[PDB]
């Protein structure tokens with residue numbers, strides 16, 4: 001049973017889960033990859049990797065992805081969680097020099113991953129491998145957009161480093177803006193395209209209904225994460241969380257903050273349902289009888305279908321993943337799967 005404070009009956013009833021048929025193989029291949037790239041210790045991979053459900057999350061999201069594309073996304077995603085863990089540990093241990101250097105290396109590797117496939121920092125080498133593979137599906141223009149988006153993500157993580165080091169809790173609106181970057185909204189939105197096999201023209205992916213649907217899917221996932229990961233984050237002195245900003249700057253109690261975050265998450269669902277109709281109408285309109293129109297139509301339809309799947313995959317992931325099971329840890333401040 002999902003804890004009452006985290007339960008969303010509309011998701012449970014109206015957003016039926018989907019699972020990509022490649023999932024079983026994906027689970028094993030990503031685990032093997034984490035080991036080969038030395039991203040986590042062998043004993044921790046054995047005990048925790050599968051229980052973290054990182055592949056499950058992506059396999060419930062990018063439905064219809066060619067297996068090769070799904071593999072690359074899952075590897076990159078598992079890398080992304082490990083980076084989030086490294087970032088946290090660097091901050092906790094006050095390793096400002098190590099963080100700055102990693103930051104600079106990621107910016108560099110992002111632009112030229114091939115050159116960094118065997119970097120001494122296994123986190124950098126892991127990054128380079130997944131990004132090189134991601135860069136092999138679509139034209140260079142998509143690769144450039146992914147890079148542009150991720151350069152922005154890296155810098156948001158830097159901003160987080162300095163907030164936490166300096167003991168600052170962002171204001172609510174400052175936070176909401178930053179969160180679109182720390183959650184990598186536009187990266188996941190970018191990845192819809194290789195998943196449906198088509199780089200969408202700016203005029204298509206920037207259609208207002210496509211844009212708004214894409215945004216709301218991510219706002220849901222990010223804010224729902226905030227809601228579910230709040231106890232783990234409070235315990236680990238993370239300050240980045242919609243609820244923490246509300247508690248700190250709106251004088252809300254924990255109870256009130258949880259309530260407000262819930263409300264905002266719920267509004268996301270019903271706002272998405274409305275714009276979803278417009279985005280699907282757009283997909284229909286693209287199908288104008290031409291070969292190109294049919295291609296674009298089917299790709300928009302698939303992408304919007306996956307925007308919808310993010311809701312259920314992200315929802316269930318927070319209840320299945322070991323990542324958030326802080327009640328199960330002896331030291332609530334130090335998750336067992338992180339390198340401390």
Ligand SMILES: CC[N+](CC)(CC)Cc1ccccc1
Nearest residue numbers: 080081084182183184225314
């Ligand atoms: C570190 C977590 N993550 C994904 C790697 C960073 C963007 C956000 C996320 C959390 C939970 C579900 C989905 C995404």
Ligand SMILES: [Mg+2]
Nearest residue numbers: 084085088238
């Ligand atoms: Mg985190």
Ligand SMILES: [Mg+2]
Nearest residue numbers: 084087182240
């Ligand atoms: Mg984070």
Ligand SMILES: [Mg+2]
Nearest residue numbers: 225226229233
């Ligand atoms: Mg969180």
